[PDB]
């Protein structure tokens, strides 16, 4: 599809659930084919958006 | 759950009024009468400790502003002091705040065993009160010589600033910690 702009297309992707306090995002599954590694400290009540990917991460429980 | 930021809760808000007490004014004046009048900021630590005792062991944002007003400084100069030190509980804590042994001089004799019992039996997640605020678990730093390995520290915030005590118990055991927690729940203080 191409009717949806990427800004409106990334928002519908469900946020990832992480058990820990910080999660490292590397883009693609292969580290060398994604963006530089980014450690995000997810502590607020809102999802933490990866600045490169746009992926969102939500902490469920410690 | 140690956070350096507020995210205001309905329990504690900056606009909520907070004074020390009618009787505590004498203590405030006495503690302020230790330093030169221009250096009223030197009493920030004792005033914060007194506010923590008066509130119940947890220091809210309103009491921080009240202390800042008393010493006539910017409010953040009190937030910095309160956050830096390890004896200013910023989140709500129960009346009898229990504590765990220190890391390097205590764990040598194998004191990790007791804290497992404290967190597992009759306990909830660390830093959390029960259905009602009675007990809580935190980290504690040893006074000195760990001549006795298992040591539990309690803080008496039940009676406020008048009945505030800071006692240390040595030779604690999974059964001894039990009998002491029911003794505290009953009300009578244990011996040390």
């Amino acid at each position: 599809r191409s009717k949806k702009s990427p800004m409106e297309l990334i928002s519908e992707v469900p946020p990832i659930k992480v058990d820990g306090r910080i999660v490292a995002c590397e883009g693609d599954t292969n580290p060398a084919l994604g963006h530089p590694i980014e450690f995000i400290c997810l502590d607020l009540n809102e999802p933490a958006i990866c600045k490169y990917c746009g992926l969102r991460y939500v902490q469920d429980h410690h | 759950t140690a956070l350096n930021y507020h995210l205001d809760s309905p329990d504690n808000k900056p606009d909520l009024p907070w004074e020390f007490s009618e009787a505590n004014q004498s203590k405030v004046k006495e503690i302020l009468s230790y330093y030169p009048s221009n250096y009223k900021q030197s009493a920030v630590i004792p005033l914060l400790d007194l506010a923590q005792q008066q509130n119940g062991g947890w220091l809210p944002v309103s009491a921080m502003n009240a202390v800042a007003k008393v010493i006539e400084v910017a409010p953040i100069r009190v937030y910095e002091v309160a956050t830096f030190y390890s004896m200013f509980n910023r989140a709500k804590v129960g009346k009898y705040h229990l504590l765990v042994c220190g890391t390097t001089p205590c764990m040598i004799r194998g004191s990790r065993d007791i804290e497992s019992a404290l967190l597992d039996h009759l306990g909830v997640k660390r830093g959390e009160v029960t259905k009602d605020g009675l007990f809580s678990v935190g980290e504690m730093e040893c006074m000195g010589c760990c001549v006795n390995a298992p040591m539990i520290t309690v803080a008496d915030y039940s009676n406020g600033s008048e009945g505030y005590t800071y006692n240390y118990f040595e030779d604690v055991t999974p059964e001894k910690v039990v009998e002491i927690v029911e003794k505290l729940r009953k009300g009578e203080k244990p011996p040390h």
Partner: protein
């Protein structure tokens, strides 16, 4: 004597009644001799006390070794308006050492009168006692003793029947290891973050409130009441040319019956551990390692722990100085890597994060210890660890960075084969399980 620097006859000790034998509030203090003939002690000039300190050969106690008389001499002789304060480092930080809590609980008037003697020695104006926040009982006992002293008339205006006045106040911190530092003490007492300031503005020039102040340890000033009344030669002839004063020791660790009595400071480790505190758990045979002094000291193994003294010069010559003089023995039944890793984590926990080499270096050391404890590291990691410790030490604002780099350096200098064995067994397991 000189062949052996040992033997306490139970009347050569200074801190009598350190077990709460008698009520140490006013009557016991008066009985043992506290507040005795203090009128002439403080009325016999000011430079006499400084000369007494200089010739008595007093050493820095409970911290960096430094001649106490020379340090006191740095205070201004004529005051250009700025009042002189005297803050006592009553903070008993670095857990594992309790040589000050016991003194506070059982000899309050000792230190309380030592404050007055030191203040008249350096023309001070007021005394500040900074007790830990976790010493509520000790603080209450000390303030009760101070209230009794105020009632008697030994302090305040016209102290001890002398024209000179004095003041002793009680300030209690809030439980930070860095707050025990000689400058973070002043920063916290000023009522702000307890982060040490830089060295060139020495406290003797501009300290508390910007006024010339001097920081002394509680037990370093608590031997001042007994340096004049009992004379200087009563203890200065106990030890070495500059190492004398009957330093207190707090033995602890994996040894049965841990005593805490004071002794001569030039005592061999073997004699002190097999005479007073029974013997090492399991005997002298195990004797994995020992730390002379507190937890801020480089490690000393079984090879060189014997036939050396608790003297600052010789211990420094064994690249492992004397700190607060509270040793912790290590037996063969406990791994030394885990204890040193826990020491590194303790240093990481209390670093006030001001200067860069300590702020991130103390965390990097902890991560390296966690990796190496289970053998997850490689063989080449030891040299990088040495380089990291060398980078940390010498570049920090205060000495905590050195205190955090010393234990790991001592471990990798005296227990390198243990790390190599752990690495080798991890590698062989890795190659065995496919």
């Amino acid at each position: 004597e000189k062949t052996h620097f040992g033997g306490l006859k139970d009347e050569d000790r200074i801190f009598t009644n350190l077990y709460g034998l008698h009520d140490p509030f006013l009557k016991g203090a008066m009985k043992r001799g506290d507040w005795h003939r203090t009128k002439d002690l403080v009325l016999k000039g000011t430079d006499w006390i400084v000369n007494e300190m200089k010739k008595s050969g007093l050493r820095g106690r409970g911290g960096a070794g430094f001649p106490s008389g020379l340090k006191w001499s740095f205070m201004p002789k004529v005051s250009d308006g700025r009042p002189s304060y005297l803050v006592v480092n009553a903070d008993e930080s670095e857990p594992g050492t309790c040589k000050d809590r016991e003194i506070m609980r059982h000899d309050p008037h000792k230190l309380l009168e030592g404050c007055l003697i030191a203040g008249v020695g350096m023309r001070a104006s007021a005394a500040y006692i900074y007790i830990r926040g976790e010493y509520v009982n000790e603080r209450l006992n000390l303030e009760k003793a101070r209230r009794e002293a105020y009632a008697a008339g030994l302090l305040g205006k016209n102290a001890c029947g002398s024209g000179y006045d004095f003041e002793v106040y009680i300030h209690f911190g809030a439980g930070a290891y860095i707050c025990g530092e000689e400058t973070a003490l002043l920063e916290s007492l000023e009522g702000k973050q307890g982060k040490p300031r830089l060295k060139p503005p020495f406290p003797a020039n501009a300290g508390l409130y910007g006024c010339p102040t001097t920081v002394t340890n509680v037990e370093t000033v608590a031997v001042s009441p007994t340096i004049l009344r009992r004379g200087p030669e009563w203890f200065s002839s106990f030890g070495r040319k500059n190492n004398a004063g009957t330093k207190l020791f707090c033995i602890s660790g994996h040894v049965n019956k841990p005593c805490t009595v004071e002794e001569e400071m030039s005592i061999p480790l073997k004699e002190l551990i097999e005479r007073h505190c029974g013997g090492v758990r399991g005997g002298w045979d195990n004797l994995l390692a020992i730390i002379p002094g507190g937890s801020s000291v480089p490690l000393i193994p079984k090879n060189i722990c014997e036939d050396v003294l608790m003297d600052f010069d010789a211990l420094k010559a064994v690249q492992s100085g004397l700190g607060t003089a509270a040793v912790i023995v290590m037996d063969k039944s406990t791994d030394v890597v885990d204890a040193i890793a826990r020491l590194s984590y303790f240093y990481k926990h209390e670093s006030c994060g001001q200067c860069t080499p300590c702020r991130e270096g103390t965390g990097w050391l902890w991560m390296i210890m966690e990796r190496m404890k289970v053998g997850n590291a490689k063989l080449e990691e030891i040299d990088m660890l040495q380089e990291v410790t060398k980078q940390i030490e010498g570049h920090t604002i205060c000495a905590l960075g050195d205190a955090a780099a010393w234990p790991v350096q001592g471990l990798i200098r005296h227990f390198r084969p243990e790390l190599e064995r752990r690495i080798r067994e991890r590698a062989e397991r890795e190659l065995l399980q496919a």
